[PDB]
Design a protein around this ligand. Structure first.
Ligand SMILES: Nc1ccnc2cc(Cl)ccc12
Length: 457
């Protein structure tokens, strides 16, 4: 048995009772933040599953500055008191205390620091003081066994700083050629739904929605922080993914309802159905639901005469997409396809939101509240499926002019979201009014041929 310091001066060695930790290598069910730090840096074993889950979900019960304080407090272990050795090293039982407890614990902390800056460097971008403390502390760790960890952490910090100042941290195998229809490359003014190639529209939208999907970190989904006061700071990538799906859905609605001429409106809807087929060929389920949500809106769905003018095979494909999105059948298709894939966030957000409400944040033992860590583990497992599809990229070339075209898509203009949808429903009542109104007469406004080039590459 080692000679530990007093628990009054190093509270990480407090007798594990029921009022500080609850179990069910043991699985941590809950406990105080002091006990969680000790288990995070426990010397008797190494649980990477516990380090990954902690760093992903710790912000729901501990501030980043507070976590760095606890890890530094865990690092600066005061050894017990020999006294005459002052001005010289000490020996005997301190060698056993340093080799079996001090060295492994301090090595566990450096691995926590290394895993922190590697996968969660955004904590240090939002807080420069947090990065200054770590760099100041890392530069003071003495020892040869820790010199490999100190140089490794400082190397990651440098590489991360080079990535933020550059913007990019793009290797492919053989990418297919870029398709073009009426819009010649380099002429962004002629870019439109009916002038660009439907194959390339779905390709560029899949590549853009894939990049937005891969920038989303799991911590942006913990604690429902995207529906709180600081949602713009806590979930910037998740909200940017949501704002893109809403804008593209309204863009598909805007293209359909603003085609006043009947023949031109049938060509636009047919072009969208073709883009839908390439979306499901690319396993872009986000783009599929953008089109499904567009045709399910009150503005588009009420256009009975437009849908009946389509080919039966055109309607069947669209009806199949609306059927499978009802999301009972969306789970079967996603659980059978391999990456590259762009899944739909909205169903995972629902499973997380209902889990945040289905479990209490704090367990209680004897009047002392413990941090319910099991709630954080279940949420972390829902986010684990998202990172699964983010690993593999798409083997598709990026078109810069088309990328910026879809990045800057703002169909609402300066109006709000509810104001724009009312404009779409009023426009739908103009092109196909309610019965018993007569069919209106609108002339062909397109100055170019609306015939589709096709879906085959
Ligand atoms: N009015 C309609 C008639 C037939 N099929 C339709 C399919 C969708 Cl997706 C929306 C409206 C329809």
């Amino acid at each position: 048995q080692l000679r530990l310091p007093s628990p009054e001066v190093y509270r990480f060695v407090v007798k594990d009772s029921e009022e500080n930790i609850v179990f069910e290598i043991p699985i941590i069910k809950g406990g105080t933040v002091v006990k969680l730090i000790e288990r995070l840096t426990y010397h008797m074993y190494a649980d990477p599953n516990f380090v990954r889950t902690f760093l992903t979900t710790y912000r729901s019960f501990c501030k980043p500055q507070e976590l760095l304080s606890l890890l530094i407090e865990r690092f600066e272990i005061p050894e017990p008191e020999a006294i005459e050795k002052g001005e010289q090293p000490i020996s005997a039982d301190l060698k056993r205390f340093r080799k079996e407890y001090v060295q492994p614990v301090q090595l566990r902390i450096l691995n926590v620091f290394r895993h922190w800056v590697e996968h969660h460097f955004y904590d240090f971008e939002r807080d420069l003081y947090l990065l200054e403390r770590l760099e100041s502390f890392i530069s003071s760790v003495r020892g040869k066994a820790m010199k490999k960890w100190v140089e490794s952490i400082a190397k990651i910090i440098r590489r991360k700083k080079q990535a933020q100042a550059n913007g990019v941290s793009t290797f492919e195998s053989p990418p297919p050629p870029i398709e073009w229809h009426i819009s010649k490359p380099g002429h962004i003014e002629t870019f439109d739904l009916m002038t660009l190639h439907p194959i390339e529209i779905a390709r560029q939208l899949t590549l853009l929605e894939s990049d937005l999907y891969r920038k989303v970190q799991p911590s942006e989904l913990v604690g429902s922080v995207w529906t709180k006061e600081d949602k713009e700071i806590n979930s910037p990538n998740l909200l940017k993914m949501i704002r893109h799906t809403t804008n593209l859905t309204l863009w598909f609605e805007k293209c359909i309802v603003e085609a006043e001429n009947f023949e031109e409106r049938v060509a636009v809807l047919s072009r969208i159905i073709e883009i839908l087929q390439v979306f499901q060929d690319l396993n872009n389920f986000n783009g599929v639901l953008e089109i499904v949500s567009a045709v399910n809106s009150v503005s588009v769905y009420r256009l009975d005469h437009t849908f009946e003018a389509l080919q039966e095979r055109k309607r069947k494909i669209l009806d199949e997409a609306v059927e499978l999105s009802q999301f009972k059948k969306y789970l079967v298709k996603l659980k059978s396809i391999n990456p590259p894939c762009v899944p739909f966030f909205g169903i995972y957000l629902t499973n997380i939101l209902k889990t945040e409400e289905g479990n209490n944040d704090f367990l209680t033992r004897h009047g002392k509240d413990l941090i319910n860590f099991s709630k954080r583990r279940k949420v972390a497992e829902i986010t684990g499926e998202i990172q699964q599809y983010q690993n593999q990229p798409y083997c598709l070339r990026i078109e810069p002019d088309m990328r910026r075209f879809f990045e800057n898509l703002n169909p609402m203009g300066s109006a709000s979201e509810k104001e724009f949808t009312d404009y779409l429903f009023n426009k739908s009542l103009e092109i196909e009014p309610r019965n018993p109104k007569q069919p209106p007469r609108f002339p062909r406004k397109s100055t170019f041929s609306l015939k589709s080039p096709g879906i085959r590459p």
